[PDB]
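Lecture 7, part 2: worked example. A protein chain together with zinc ion.
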Amino acid sequence: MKLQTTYPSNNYPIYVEHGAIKYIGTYLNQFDQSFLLIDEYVNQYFANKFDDILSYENVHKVIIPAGEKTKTFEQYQETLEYILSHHVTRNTAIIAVGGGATGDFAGFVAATLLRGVHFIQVPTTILAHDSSVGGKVGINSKQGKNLIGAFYRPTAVIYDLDFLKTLPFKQILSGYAEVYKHALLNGESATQDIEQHFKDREILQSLNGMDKYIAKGIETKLDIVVADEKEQGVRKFLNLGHTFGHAVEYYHKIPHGHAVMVGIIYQFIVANALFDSKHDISHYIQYLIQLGYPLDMITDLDFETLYQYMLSDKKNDKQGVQMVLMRQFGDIVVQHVDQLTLQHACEQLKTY
Ligand SMILES: O=C(O)[C@]1(O)C[C@H](CP(=O)(O)O)[C@@H](O)[C@H](O)C1
Ligand SMILES: [Zn+2]
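Predicted complex, written out as structure tokens:
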């Protein structure tokens, strides 16, 4: 399945197939050079996977830190300086091969190399069905996740759906949180429909019918990003449950999806607190348990530290904290949420 961003100028493809890993080479030699940034663990896993195209005269393998441990200022310099020492050109390409983390990083590298070079997204996780589309790249700060980065359109995205066969459950759950989020955004139908298909752990864990809920996720985003690339309003909707989520992920150091799920239920808690959309909290809470989500850190949360982090959030203004709330499937709204709600929603979410 091939897709394409419908922007005015410079648009990119997105190959979502079970052999998409082949679509790499139709580019490699049309670039003076190519630098393959690959996660340190992904590199072990798929040792020869990328020899068919790496044993070339242009391609060089660059091994960065595993996941979120690469998204730092320090690594940014090293990797860039290392790269440049190869007398590159403005027509070089950066091939990201790994999770969302190696993707954000390689992307921020590519986006700033000689003021911008070529970028090829090659996701290998479920969560990266999300992170590889939209052009958002970057690293982390001492203040929070993704606080330095940029909007840079990749030349093309290549999502080989065969990489899911090696994903551990902890990452299925993690990636599933984004597949589920796009669903919540797709309406009461798509939610209860995906909730109906992926009923419990064993279903998810098996991954049957996943190939479908991913393509549906990618599409759903491709729409919000083409329609509002610079997050000038609507794209703020992909941030569903990330306000609290990003705070739990950074401070509690738990997987992105896991935090997002917890960020989701908390968001409903607020949508009650304010609009009183009367959300079935007991429903969502349970559905997560079945799927197999941990929920052990729920008790170790801490409104105080999370709140201060929540002030770094990229959606706020001078007025204070800001969240993406759901009032009804098809009625998502963004707005201020003073410490009040955040004081009694982190405690009502503790009720569980
Ligand atoms: O607009 C996007 O691409 C996102 O909102 C981007 C966020 C990252 P941000 O909140 O740091 O921009 C990502 O976590 C989410 O899954 C999708
Ligand atoms: Zn996310």
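Residues 130, 134, 136, 145-146, 178, 231, 235, 238-239, 242, 314 surround CRB (ligand 1) (CB under 6 Å). Residues 169-186 form the longest helix (18 residues). Keep this in mind for problem set question 3.
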